[model samples]
Structures are given as C-alpha cells and as structure tokens.
Target: SCPPGQFRCSEPPGAHGECYPQDWLCDGHPDCDDGRDEWGCG
Candidate 1:
C-alpha cells in the first residue's frame, strides 16, 4: 500500500509498488514509469 498523501500506479505490472506525491497526479507529467500518473486527468 502507498503511504499517506501518495498515489499508487497499479498497472504495467512492475508499477504496482510504485508511488508518487498525490498532487503530482495530474500535473501534466509522467511521474510514474508507466505514465499512470498522467492517465486519468486531462
């Protein structure tokens, strides 16, 4: 599980254990290696 205030990228297999700061989710950058950080928002 991710820590408080962090977002988890649960796809691309290896991305399952990865996390980034929650605010980075929709910041127009691919913070997660699989780009899950930029997936849902436009």
Candidate 2:
C-alpha cells in the first residue's frame, strides 16, 4: 500500500533497486536496513 507517488514491495525499496516514495532515499533509511529489497523465489 504505497502512498501518493509511492511504490509497494515485498521487501524494501522496489524493483531495480529503485527507492519508493516511502523509502528514505539515500538518507540511510532503516525501514529495511538489511537491504533485502528483492529475494530469489526460484
């Protein structure tokens, strides 16, 4: 559920390592500090 101009993701950020509107950009946000934006489901 991304806010206006925001993007949704199962982990953090979004696709292609792109930061979502909810993401704190390069400010070092701790929402998903683990940096597991995407995982291999294969």
Candidate 3:
C-alpha cells in the first residue's frame, strides 16, 4: 500500500499499483491503468 499523501492506483486483488504524487492527478494525464487519477476530472 502507498503511504500517506501518495495516490494509490486502482488494481485487482487489492494489489497496489504504481504510486503517484498528488499533483499528477487531474492534470490531464492518466497515471493509473483504470485512469483513476483522471476520473471525474474536468
């Protein structure tokens, strides 16, 4: 699992995918395989 302040990617089987910084989210780039970082983003 990623530590506090780290954005954890969505993965199957409760596996922790690549951890990204908070700033990367909703920046128009999809970091997670499921694109969770870009989800609900305008």
| Maximum-lDDT candidate | 1
Error of 3 at 3 (Å): 4.7
Over the stretch 1-42, how does candidate 1's per-residue lDDT look in tens digits? 478877676554455666678777787887777777788873
Residues 15-42, model 3: lDDT tens digits: 7566877666787988777778888863
Per-candidate clashes, comma-separated:
0, 0, 0
lDDT-based ranking:
1, 3, 2
CA-only RMSD, every prediction? 3.5, 9.1, 2.9
In candidate 1, stretches whose alpha carbon ends up further than 4 angstroms from where it belongs are 10-18
How many angstroms is residue 18 displaced in model 3 relative to the true structure, after the best TM-score fit? 4.7
Tens-digit lDDT track for model 2 on 1-42? Answer: 455655444454434353455443333433434533333311
TM-score of 1: 0.56
Q: How far does residue 7 in candidate 1 sit from its true spot (Å)?
A: 1.6
Instruction: Give the lowest summed-lDDT range of ten residues in model 1.
Output: 10-19
Better of 2 and 3 by TM-score: 3
Estimate the overall C-alpha local distance difference test score of candidate 3: 0.71
Model 2 bad stretches (over 4 Å):
1-4, 11-23, 33-42
